[PDB]
Design an enzyme around this catalytic site. Structure first.
Site, PDB file in Angstrom:
ATOM      1  N   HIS A  39       0.763   4.174  -1.200  1.00 38.54           N
ATOM      2  CA  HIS A  39       0.135   3.594  -0.021  1.00 38.54           C
ATOM      3  C   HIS A  39      -0.134   4.452   1.183  1.00 38.54           C
ATOM      4  O   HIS A  39      -0.825   3.967   2.079  1.00 38.54           O
ATOM      5  CB  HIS A  39       1.011   2.393   0.460  1.00 38.54           C
ATOM      6  CG  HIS A  39       1.324   1.440  -0.656  1.00 38.54           C
ATOM      7  ND1 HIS A  39       0.368   0.626  -1.218  1.00 38.54           N
ATOM      8  CD2 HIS A  39       2.463   1.182  -1.339  1.00 38.54           C
ATOM      9  CE1 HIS A  39       0.884  -0.104  -2.182  1.00 38.54           C
ATOM     10  NE2 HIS A  39       2.163   0.198  -2.259  1.00 38.54           N
ATOM     11  N   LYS A  97      -4.994   0.214 -11.921  1.00 37.24           N
ATOM     12  CA  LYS A  97      -4.118  -0.675 -11.098  1.00 37.24           C
ATOM     13  C   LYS A  97      -5.102  -1.625 -10.426  1.00 37.24           C
ATOM     14  O   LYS A  97      -6.053  -1.124  -9.832  1.00 37.24           O
ATOM     15  CB  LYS A  97      -3.368   0.165 -10.090  1.00 37.24           C
ATOM     16  CG  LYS A  97      -2.204  -0.595  -9.512  1.00 37.24           C
ATOM     17  CD  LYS A  97      -1.523   0.207  -8.409  1.00 37.24           C
ATOM     18  CE  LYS A  97      -0.419  -0.660  -7.831  1.00 37.24           C
ATOM     19  NZ  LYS A  97      -0.167  -0.383  -6.385  1.00 37.24           N
ATOM     20  N   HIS A 109       8.045  -1.342  -0.697  1.00 30.59           N
ATOM     21  CA  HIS A 109       7.068  -2.209  -1.377  1.00 30.59           C
ATOM     22  C   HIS A 109       6.101  -2.737  -0.338  1.00 30.59           C
ATOM     23  O   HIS A 109       6.514  -2.969   0.812  1.00 30.59           O
ATOM     24  CB  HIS A 109       7.916  -3.314  -2.023  1.00 30.59           C
ATOM     25  CG  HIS A 109       7.238  -4.621  -2.213  1.00 30.59           C
ATOM     26  ND1 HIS A 109       6.350  -4.893  -3.250  1.00 30.59           N
ATOM     27  CD2 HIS A 109       7.280  -5.744  -1.441  1.00 30.59           C
ATOM     28  CE1 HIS A 109       5.871  -6.116  -3.110  1.00 30.59           C
ATOM     29  NE2 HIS A 109       6.432  -6.664  -2.029  1.00 30.59           N
ATOM     30  N   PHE A 110       4.827  -2.815  -0.729  1.00 28.41           N
ATOM     31  CA  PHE A 110       3.785  -3.305   0.176  1.00 28.41           C
ATOM     32  C   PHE A 110       3.561  -4.773  -0.180  1.00 28.41           C
ATOM     33  O   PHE A 110       3.086  -5.066  -1.277  1.00 28.41           O
ATOM     34  CB  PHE A 110       2.452  -2.596   0.006  1.00 28.41           C
ATOM     35  CG  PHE A 110       1.484  -2.860   1.122  1.00 28.41           C
ATOM     36  CD1 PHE A 110       0.634  -3.959   1.095  1.00 28.41           C
ATOM     37  CD2 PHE A 110       1.426  -1.994   2.198  1.00 28.41           C
ATOM     38  CE1 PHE A 110      -0.259  -4.192   2.114  1.00 28.41           C
ATOM     39  CE2 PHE A 110       0.548  -2.229   3.235  1.00 28.41           C
ATOM     40  CZ  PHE A 110      -0.293  -3.319   3.185  1.00 28.41           C
ATOM     41  N   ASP A 111       3.893  -5.668   0.739  1.00 30.22           N
ATOM     42  CA  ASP A 111       3.740  -7.092   0.410  1.00 30.22           C
ATOM     43  C   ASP A 111       2.394  -7.642   0.738  1.00 30.22           C
ATOM     44  O   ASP A 111       1.744  -8.295  -0.098  1.00 30.22           O
ATOM     45  CB  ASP A 111       4.831  -7.853   1.160  1.00 30.22           C
ATOM     46  CG  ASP A 111       5.212  -9.188   0.562  1.00 30.22           C
ATOM     47  OD1 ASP A 111       5.701  -9.224  -0.590  1.00 30.22           O
ATOM     48  OD2 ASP A 111       5.028 -10.232   1.218  1.00 30.22           O
TER      49      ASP A 111
HETATM   50 CL   LIG Z   1      -1.088  -3.289  -2.436  1.00 35.96          CL
END
Ligand SMILES: [Cl-]
Ligand SMILES: [Cl-]
Ligand SMILES: [Cl-]
EC number: 4.6.1.18
Length: 124
Positions: free
Chosen positions: A12, A41, A119-121
């Protein structure tokens, strides 16, 4: 092998640009960050802020994660981000992505010591 924190950075962080300028940004970045290797992805968000500003979100507004966990934090301010999403015509290994630039709050899950994003929420 990759730590959770290093995986978050790789998937990210894009502090080298202030915003996605072309509609080809997602196809080039998903490939160079190695996210189209074993498969395409489906969705991925890149943040164009410094790593220190993103890490600082772990000390901002504590909120629930979509999964119900409570180690999620929402940035107080909006950040420059790029949403990368596979188009209906994307087919491994010819991954095709739609690039959508925006300025919004990010929500991330944090863990460890140091307490950093893992983690990207979501983004709001
Ligand atoms: Cl994402
Ligand atoms: Cl690490
Ligand atoms: Cl890699």
């Amino acid at each position: 092998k990759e730590t959770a924190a290093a995986k978050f950075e790789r998937q990210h962080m894009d502090s080298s640009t202030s915003a996605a300028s072309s509609s080809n940004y997602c196809n080039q970045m998903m490939k160079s960050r190695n996210l189209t290797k074993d498969r395409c992805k489906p969705v991925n968000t890149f943040v164009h802020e410094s790593l220190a500003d993103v890490q600082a979100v772990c000390s901002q507004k504590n909120v629930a994660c979509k999964n119900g966990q409570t180690n999620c934090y929402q940035s107080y301010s909006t950040m420059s981000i790029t949403d990368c999403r596979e188009t209906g015509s994307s087919k491994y290994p010819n991954c095709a992505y739609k690039t959508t630039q925006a300025n919004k709050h990010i929500i991330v899950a944090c863990e460890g010591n140091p307490y950093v994003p893992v983690h990207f929420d979501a983004s709001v």
